[PDB]
Each structure stands twice: as C-alpha cells, then as structure tokens.
C-alpha cells in the first residue's frame, strides 16, 4: 500500500486514500 | 520531491502526509 516504490498513478492513488477530504498537491517536477 | 521520496525511494506515510492540504 503505502510502504513500497510509488510512481505514477500508483502514487496519486495513494495520496488520494491517505490524505481523504483534505486533498493534496502533485508536483513531479518539484 | 515526492518522485524522489517516494517512486525513486521507498514512500512512507510521513512523507505522504507533507502533501495533503
């Protein structure tokens, strides 16, 4: 789930269930 | 950035938390 290489779709999906309600940015280029 | 710490590395729920609203 959260505890492995996260990339692409596979991270976005992730910070949607983890962070819920409150949202959350997506910056690759960062 | 979360590439780094996260696709490149391995993520962590402390990492991922720095990025919700």
């Known amino acids: ?30 | 950035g979360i590439v780094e710490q996260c696709c490149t590395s391995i993520c962590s729920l402390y990492q991922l938390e720095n990025y919700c609203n």
């Open chain 1, 1 to 30: 789930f959260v505890n492995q290489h996260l990339c692409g779709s596979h991270l976005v999906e992730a910070l949607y269930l983890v962070c819920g309600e409150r949202g959350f940015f997506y910056t690759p280029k960062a």
